[PDB]
């Protein structure tokens, strides 16, 4: 169901974090993810993986894999993405506007003072909700770009992911 896309998403995210952001698991993480709070977990194992580097390419890079991953989706799958934009981000959007609207959402949301100017190297994440298939638990990875800015885009993308499992 959604698992493939998430993995596929996660892989392009790391593949493109190296090829463009020039990062490595061995790279020193300026910011690191502390704890992952799910208010209602009904089948999701969420792990953090460090692909830290040094942010606009991180941001530009994460946008690429999302766009490419959305494009790969079957049009009849992709029709589900706008409902989860409204639910997860309170964004009004449609199939043809996904790439732009998300783009500007992350550009606008994640380039805000609250993000860049925050003094915590260990940042938490809170997620309302996440479901897993009975017997088949959704397994997801939070790629720690290493900067507030990049993690914001990761977060936004994770809020859409978890929202999908409903």
């Amino acid at each position: 169901s959604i698992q493939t896309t998430v993995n596929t998403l996660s892989e392009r995210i790391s593949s493109k974090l190296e090829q463009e952001a020039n990062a490595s698991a061995q790279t020193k993480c300026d910011i690191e993810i502390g704890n992952f709070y799910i208010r209602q977990n009904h089948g999701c194992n969420i792990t953090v993986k460090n692909m830290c580097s040094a942010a606009d390419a991180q941001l530009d890079a994460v946008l690429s894999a999302a766009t490419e991953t959305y494009s790969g989706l079957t049009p009849e799958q992709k029709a589900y993405v706008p409902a989860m934009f409204t639910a997860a981000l309170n964004i009004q959007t449609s199939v043809n506007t996904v790439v732009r609207d998300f783009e500007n959402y992350v550009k606008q949301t994640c380039n805000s003072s609250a993000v860049v100017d925050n003094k915590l190297k260990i940042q938490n994440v809170i997620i309302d909700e996440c479901y897993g298939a009975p017997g088949s638990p959704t397994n997801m990875e939070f790629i720690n770009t290493g900067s507030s800015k990049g993690n914001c885009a990761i977060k936004a993308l994770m809020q859409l992911t978890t929202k999908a499992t409903t």
Epitope: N35, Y37, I38, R39, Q40, N41, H42, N124, I126
Partner: antibody, heavy 123, light 108 residues
Framework: EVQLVESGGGVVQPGRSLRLSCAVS????????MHWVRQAPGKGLQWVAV????????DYEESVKGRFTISRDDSKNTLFLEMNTVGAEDTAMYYC????????????????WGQGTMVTVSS | DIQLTQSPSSVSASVGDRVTITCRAS??????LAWYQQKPGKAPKLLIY???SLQSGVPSRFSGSGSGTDFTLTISSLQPEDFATYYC?????????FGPGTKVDIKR
């Protein structure tokens, strides 16, 4: 019914250490997130720290991060707050509380409260 | 951090009065808001969760409402045992913060 019973309070000198205990009946800690909440004399309530159901993940209010350690002993179903570098700002009634959430959810509100244990930090 | 303010700072009532306390959050918190009751010398006790859900056992004359930034806690018919200080609390994000309290005393 869920019973939470704190102990360990007392008078303590600045910079030194203390351990508060909260004995819990009616519920297994492995099945509940847990918190500590303090109340300085004459003041409001302030959240201190949270321990996960798994007994190991944790978070802290900024002011006490580094100095306090929240943990538990499953064998005894007891929650603990280890206070190591106490200043007079830490004077307070310390309340052990339960997150209404269990091993698969978080609510971040506090449905059961202990009777309280008072810590006075003074020279 | 999320600041919670409470109005009125105090209130005096007779037994049977309708009493309403307000809690305003510095930022939107949806319905992640709870209210506690506390009496002198005693631990807080939870009354309302998720803005409008009454905690089991709590007398039916307590209710809450609101979502976003502005919330209310109403006692439809104050009873001698309701004279106490009331605190609201946000459950949206760390650190979990509390309002300053609103004391309800016996009118004379």
């Amino acid at each position: 019914e869920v019973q939470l019973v704190e102990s360990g309070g007392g008078v303590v000198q600045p910079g030194r250490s203390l351990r508060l205990s909260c004995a819990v009946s009616g519920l297994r800690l492995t099945n509940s997130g847990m918190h500590w909440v303090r109340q300085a004399p004459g003041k409001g309530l302030q959240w201190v720290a949270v321990l996960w159901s798994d007994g190991r993940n944790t978070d802290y209010e900024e002011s006490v991060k580094g100095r306090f350690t929240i943990s538990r002993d499953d064998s005894k179903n007891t929650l603990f707050l280890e206070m190591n570098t106490v200043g007079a700002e830490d004077t307070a009634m310390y309340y052990c509380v339960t997150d209404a959430g269990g091993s698969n959810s978080w609510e971040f509100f506090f449905d059961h409260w202990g009777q309280g244990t008072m810590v006075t930090v003074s020279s | 951090d999320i600041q919670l303010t409470q109005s009125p700072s105090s209130v005096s009532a007779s037994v049977g009065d309708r009493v309403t306390i307000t809690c305003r959050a510095s930022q939107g918190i949806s319905s992640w808001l709870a209210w506690y009751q506390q009496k002198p010398g005693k631990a807080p006790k939870l009354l309302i969760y998720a803005a409008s859900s009454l905690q089991s056992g709590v007398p039916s004359r307590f209710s809450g409402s609101g979502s976003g930034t502005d919330f209310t806690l109403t006692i439809s018919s104050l009873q001698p045992e309701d004279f106490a200080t009331y605190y609201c609390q946000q459950a949206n994000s760390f650190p979990f913060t509390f309002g300053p309290g609103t004391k309800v005393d016996i009118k004379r």
